[PDB]
């Protein structure tokens, strides 16, 4: 547990399950709660306190499967809990080509500082909502680039349990 490489791990995680749905047009919605607590969204969902992988990820959004149908809630150093509310923005500045997993990220990001990344069923381009606004269709490079900046918070330091 040397939380930099728990952040690490997470960040991989995420891109190795998106590219993998992405390719397979395979919808998904993965909420990462940062200082805003999202406690009572992962209330909503199914708990699964599980340890993060790409392919526990990829599991999950399976289409008619009993965790698939609503968002994955990451919480810490967990899985906190699948099929999950978010509330739906109300913006009508959201494409109207956009589904409810974009409106639901979108919701969840204008309320909290969380991070959310959407899989497209229709296109499979991947979209990643923060602080209100979405960034749609992002490459492979930009969302890593993304992900490296919101969700590594720990520069190259001595690793320790303790930190
Ligand atoms: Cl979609």
Redesign the pocket.
């Given at each position: 547990s040397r939380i930099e490489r728990e952040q690490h791990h997470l960040i991989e995680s995420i891109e190795k399950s998106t590219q993998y749905m992405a390719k397979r047009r395979i919808?998904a919605?993965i909420s990462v709660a940062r200082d805003t607590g999202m406690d009572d969204y992962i209330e909503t969902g199914i708990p699964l306190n599980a340890k993060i992988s790409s392919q526990l990820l990829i599991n999950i959004f399976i289409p008619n499967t009993p965790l698939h149908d609503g968002a994955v809630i990451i919480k810490g150093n967990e899985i906190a809990s699948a099929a999950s509310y978010l509330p739906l923005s109300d913006s009508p500045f959201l494409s109207k080509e956009?589904?409810?997993?974009?409106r639901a990220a979108l919701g969840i990001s204008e309320v909290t500082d969380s991070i959310t990344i959407?899989?497209?069923?229709?296109?499979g381009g991947i979209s990643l909502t923060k602080g209100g606004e979405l960034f749609r269709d992002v490459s492979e490079e930009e969302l890593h680039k993304i992900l490296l900046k919101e969700l590594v918070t720990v520069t190259a330091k001595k690793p320790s349990i303790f930190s």
């Open positions: 919808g919605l956009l589904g409810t997993r974009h959407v899989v497209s069923e229709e296109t």
